[PDB]
């Protein structure tokens, strides 16, 4: 793992003592080489897992998150490049350093073994995100957005820390797989119910539950494109990783202390897919899409079945890639029109006839067009919840319909009408952003061809 | 598609448009030309029977009743010419109606062909940055200071001046 | 009431301008500047693919147990099987 972290740490000097003309190039190339080297983790020839130290470890669930994290970096580098172009060399080096720090901390917290290290890193992920969102946003509500994000997270995270201490005291360690080989059943008492609540709310907030989803749309709409991408792809996954790791000891409480969250997820799914029909901001639309998709992940972790966890992992990675792609697609226009309003610009696919394809495929994925991992996840979540109770299929179908509606709405109100001929400032498509979209898509094709790397722990 | 409605339609215009719609729906109902001519002559007789009348109140009443008769006897699937609203070709070539400014982004190796074309496009601009300032004054100076205003536009009264606000009525794409 | 004279002059001017825009949108010659069949198609679009497909089948789809599972062939009385040199006898006397 250290062969992955040390070079990521060295990307910093490179960034600062690189000349003002080659820093972007060099750091991007080496970030790509890091993404390449990270594939050592995929050499899993046995059911035994990796353990490089007492402090690090890798699993079939942490490896894909780690590789997606190491892959998204150069894409964010490329995407944060047109803006902050006039900004000073020092400022853009600061930006690059923020990105690299996020990379390193996310890799660490995915490769961690101890819940408290996981905690300090899952809570150190705030500084760079807050700084990016507040120092490089364009509106005046980015400050309130950072407040919301930061404090939702911390209010959810404190009781988690307290529960971790309670455990570290009852048991003598917070180490994973020891917390597994020594776990006991519980007494189904109110103290342990509150322990459950504490352990869970942090992650149920970091991946937006229906009722506490009021930090994601803000952060997205007010944040730059790299912040949007990382928030949509990985910061929404820290909660899933944490719950998949902490739910092993809370048995057998989640059999009955999970109903409220299953209900909230299955309902907010509909109640956000519907907002995706009547929202005017493209970015907020995609945010509510992310919410409606993470609801499935939540409801699937809650029921604790192998198919459920498999679908959760598949959909996690797939939604990461697809949301990053959609955000970058909307950014391509924003850079040209400086307005997130969707119905303003229309009739594209005439001057941008190719980007209308990327727009289309990112939509084919979000609406779960087979063969695709979005669907290979949704289907198995649906089957697991149908075994749970057969009446979930109703809400699942409603959500499917609304998704197929608002995806094509987003397509047609931007690319499939007639042009706003009064738009003189439609600079043709950059090779850079076409490459962004291609780098987002192709890995989805490859993971659809080899979805054995994406099932997870159970499979 | 070339003018703007007036602040209010006059009784004459109302009656004329009612006549036109009534005849179009008569065509829709009667598929054969002989029948169409027969009943069109009948309808025009019905109309002319009240052309030399002047009582405005009774006229408006006859019109309010004829419009109801029309709504009650109208064909619900009338004939619409293809390229017109409701027709099977309305807004069909808007996909190929690309504007003119889309050529300012072309690449030298693209306008390298059609060189004789792009030379004209150039001097068509020279004919625009010069003909702009005087198109404003002609509007400023021809303004009604009594508040009243409508969607009309004047021509140019000189040798060399051009109609104000022409670039978009000129330069627009073919229909094809 | 027809076109007022100002409208008529407006339309005449826009007309003489559009009939020039279109004459210009016309283009000269010498521009845009620029710098057996059944059998050959059969070969290059059927045979080569057919060779690849026969290879794939014969050596990666019939070497495996249950990849090509044909149904059983109809057999009727008198049909003498060949994998055992056998002969099944005919049916009974048909009443009529």
């Amino acid at each position: 793992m250290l062969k992955i972290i040390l070079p990521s740490l060295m990307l910093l000097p490179l960034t600062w003592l690189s000349s003002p003309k080659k820093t972007w190039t060099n750091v991007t190339s080496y970030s790509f080489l890091i993404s390449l080297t990270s594939l050592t983790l995929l050499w899993q020839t046995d059911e035994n897992y990796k353990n490089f130290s007492n402090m690090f470890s890798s699993d079939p669930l942490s490896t894909p998150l780690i590789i997606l994290t190491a892959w998204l970096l150069p894409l964010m580098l490329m995407a944060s490049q047109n803006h902050l172009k006039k900004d000073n060399n020092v400022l853009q080096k600061l930006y690059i350093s923020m990105l690299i720090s996020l990379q390193i901390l996310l890799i660490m917290t995915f490769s961690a073994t101890e819940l408290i290290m996981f905690y300090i890193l899952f809570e150190a992920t705030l500084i760079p995100t807050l700084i990016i969102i507040t120092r490089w946003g364009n509106q005046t509500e980015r400050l309130n957005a950072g407040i919301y994000f930061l404090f939702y997270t911390l209010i959810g995270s404190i009781p988690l820390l307290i529960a971790l201490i309670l455990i570290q005291n009852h048991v003598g360690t917070l180490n994973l797989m020891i917390l597994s080989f020594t776990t006991h059943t519980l007494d189904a008492s109110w103290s342990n119910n509150l322990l459950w609540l504490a352990c869970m709310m942090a992650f149920l907030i970091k991946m937006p539950l229906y009722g506490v989803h009021l930090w994601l749309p803000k952060a997205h709409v007010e944040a730059p494109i790299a912040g949007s991408m990382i928030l949509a792809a990985i910061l929404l996954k820290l909660g899933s990783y944490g719950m998949i790791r902490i739910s092993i000891i809370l048995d057998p409480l989640t059999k009955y202390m999970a109903y409220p969250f299953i209900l909230l997820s299955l309902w907010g799914m509909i109640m956000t897919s519907s907002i995706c029909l009547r929202q005017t901001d493209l970015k907020s639309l995609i945010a509510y899409s992310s919410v409606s998709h993470m609801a499935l992940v939540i409801a699937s972790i809650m029921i604790q079945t192998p198919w459920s966890f498999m679908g959760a992992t598949m959909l996690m990675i797939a939604h990461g890639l697809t949301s990053s792609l959609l955000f970058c697609l909307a950014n391509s226009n924003y850079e040209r029109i400086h307005s997130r309003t969707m119905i303003m610009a229309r009739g594209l696919q005439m001057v941008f006839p190719l980007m209308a394809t990327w727009w289309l495929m990112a939509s084919l994925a979000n609406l779960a067009l087979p063969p695709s991992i979005n669907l290979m996840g949704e289907l198995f979540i649906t089957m697991s919840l149908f075994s749970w109770s057969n009446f979930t299929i109703i809400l699942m179908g409603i959500n499917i319909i609304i998704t197929g509606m608002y995806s094509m709405y987003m397509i047609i109100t931007t690319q499939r009408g007639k042009l706003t001929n009064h738009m003189i400032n439609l600079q043709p498509s950059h090779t850079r952003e076409l490459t962004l979209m291609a780098l987002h898509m192709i890995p989805l094709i490859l993971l659809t061809t080899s979805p054995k790397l994406i099932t997870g722990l159970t499979m | 598609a070339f003018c703007a409605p007036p602040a209010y339609l006059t009784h004459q215009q109302k009656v004329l448009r009612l006549y036109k719609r009534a005849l179009r729906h008569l065509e829709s109902w009667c598929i054969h030309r002989d029948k169409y001519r027969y009943f069109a002559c009948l309808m025009r007789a019905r109309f002319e029977e009240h052309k030399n009348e002047k009582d405005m109140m009774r006229a408006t009443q006859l019109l309010r009743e004829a419009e109801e008769e029309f709504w009650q006897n109208q064909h619900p699937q009338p004939y619409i010419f293809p390229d017109s609203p409701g027709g099977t070709s309305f807004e069909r070539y808007e996909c190929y109606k690309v504007p003119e400014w889309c050529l300012d982004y072309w690449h030298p190796s693209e306008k390298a062909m059609y060189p004789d074309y792009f030379s004209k496009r150039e001097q068509w601009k020279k004919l625009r940055m010069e003909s702009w300032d005087r198109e404003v004054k002609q509007l400023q100076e021809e303004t009604s200071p009594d508040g009243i205003m409508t969607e009309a536009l004047p021509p140019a009264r000189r040798e060399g001046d051009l109609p104000p606000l022409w670039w978009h009525i000129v330069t627009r794409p073919r229909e094809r | 009431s027809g076109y007022t004279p100002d409208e008529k002059l407006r339309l005449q001017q826009l007309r003489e301008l559009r009939r020039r825009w279109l004459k210009d949108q016309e283009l000269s010659p010498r521009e845009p500047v620029l710098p057996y069949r059944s059998s050959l198609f059969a070969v290059s679009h059927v045979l080569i693919p057919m060779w690849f497909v026969h290879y794939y089948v014969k050596y990666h789809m019939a070497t495996k147990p249950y990849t090509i599972v044909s149904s059983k062939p109809r057999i009727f009385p008198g049909d003498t099987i060949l994998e055992t040199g056998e002969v099944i006898p005919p049916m009974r006397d048909f009443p009529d």
């Binding site: 006839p353 043709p428 | 690309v98 889309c102 050529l103 693209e110 059609y114 074309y117 | 016309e26």
Partner: peptide
Amino acid sequence: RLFVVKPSLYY
């Protein structure tokens, strides 16, 4: 013969 307006497509 006439001229068909189109975007760049080179990029």
